[model samples]
Target: GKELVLALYDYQEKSPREVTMKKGDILTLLNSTNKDWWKVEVNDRQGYVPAAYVKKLD
Candidate 1:
């Protein structure tokens, strides 16, 4: 199965480590397709959204 999730990446180096995820923000995934680090886009801005983020819904 596949899924999508909402999360933000705010950590390390920055004094206040917190990711403030906005509306329409999402992480898409293909089940077990990508193992290594990957880059996803948000509002056309590219960043590393980890595979771990694309987890099953609770």
Candidate 2:
């Protein structure tokens, strides 16, 4: 099972491997190996984003 999260703010990708997300977007939590950066999937695309930019959902 995958964990879900909500985007807290709009994030622009700073690198090619990073994913961009808009506020209120629902994303799947893929990996959390790094505390500052988390791997997520949205719109069928996977990439890393700032951990602080998202909120975990129940």
Q: How accurate is candidate 1 locally (lDDT)?
A: 0.41
Cα lDDT, all candidates = 0.41, 0.91
Instruction: In candidate 1, list every pair of residues with a backbone clash.
Output: none
> Among these predicted structures, which one has the highest lDDT?
2
TM-score of 1: 0.35
Q: lDDT tens digits, residues 12-56, model 2?
A: 889998999999999999987799999999878889999999988
Q: Which whole-number lDDT from 0 to 100 does residue 57 have in model 2? A: 95
Colliding residue pairs in candidate 2:
none
Candidate 1 least-lDDT 10 residues: 11-20
